Amino acid sequence: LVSVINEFKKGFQASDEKESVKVRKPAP
Amino acid sequence: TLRELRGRIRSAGSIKKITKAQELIATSRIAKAQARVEAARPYAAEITNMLTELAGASHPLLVERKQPKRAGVLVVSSDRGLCGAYNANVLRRAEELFSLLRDEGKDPVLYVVGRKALGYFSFRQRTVVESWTGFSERPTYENAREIADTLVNAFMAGADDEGDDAGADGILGVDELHIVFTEFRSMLSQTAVARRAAPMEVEYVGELYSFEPDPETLFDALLPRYIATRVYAALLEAAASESASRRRAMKSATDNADDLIKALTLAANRERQAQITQEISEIVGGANAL
C-alpha cells in the first residue's frame, strides 16, 4: 500500500505635502 | 432558556468594566504623553533653527536624480489592537500613494513598522524588504536612530545605481523617499498625512558666527540626524494619535454594551413572567380537571 501511495503521489499534479529648507539669502 | 440570558448579562457586565478601566488608563496615557511631546518640541525647534542658520550661507541628497525609477515608502501602525480605523486611514493613504505612483509609473519599495500593516501586506502578496517591530506605544531615540541609519544607507546606494543597473552603489537603489504617518494637531480629530524626505528644495527669502571652511561635512553630519529627528517626531505624533483613538473607541464600546445589557434584562424579565404564567395555568388546569 505504501509503495503504491509513493508511486501515485509523484504522478499526480497539483492544482495550485512637502518639505523645504529655509535660507535667509535673497533669491538669485 | 434564561440561563443563556444570565450568562450573556454577566459577560456584558465584565466587558463594560474592562472597557471603562481601559479608557481611563488611555486618557491618563494621553495626559502624560502630551507633556512628553511638548517637551520634545523645543529641541526640534533648536535643531531646525541651527540647520537654517547653517544653510543660510553654506551633498548628493540635495541634488536631484536625472531619471528616477523607484520610490521608497514607510508605513507606521499600532503594535496593539483596539484602535478604531487608526491603521485603516494610514493604509488608505498608502494605497492612494501607490495609485499616484502607478500613474507616474515608478515602482515602490515597502518598509513597515508595527504588526498590523505587516499582517495586512502578508495576505495581499506584497513583498516587504525590512520590517521593524518592537514598538509598545512608548518610543525612544534608539529605534529612530537605527531606522534612520538604515534608510539613509539604503538611499545613498541609489546614485551610482541608476535603477536597473547594479552599479558601484549596488542593487536596490531608490530615487525618492516618502513617509506616511498619523498627525495629531487637536484632541477632537486627527488626519493622516503623507510626506517626502529624500527630495528637497531650497527656499529663498530676503534677509559673526562661523567655523572652519568645511560646510559640506557639517551638512553631511546634520542631515541624517535631521531625518532621525523627523522620524522621532512622527513616532511621537503616532503614539499620541493612537492613544486618543483608543480612548474614543473604548468609550464607544462601553456605550454600545450598556443598552445591550438593558435589552437582555428586559427579555429575561418577560421570559420569566411567561414561564410563571405557564406553570400556574398548567397546575390549575390539572387540579380542576378532576
Binding site: - | 468594566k17 474592562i18 471603562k20 478601566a21 481611563l24 488608563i25 491618563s28 496615557r29
Partner: protein, 50 residues
Amino acid sequence: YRELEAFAAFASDLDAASKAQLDRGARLVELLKQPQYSPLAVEEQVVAIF
C-alpha cells in the same frame, strides 16, 4: 477597595492614594477570615480590629 479592584492590572500608573487604599483593602479583606470552631472574645476582636 471594592470599587477600585479593576485597576489591579495597571497599578503602576495609579496615584499614591489609590495604591494605599488598595493595599489597605487587601490587608483588611485578608484579616476577616477565620477557621471554624474558634469563637473570639470581644476584647480580642476589638484589639484585632483596632
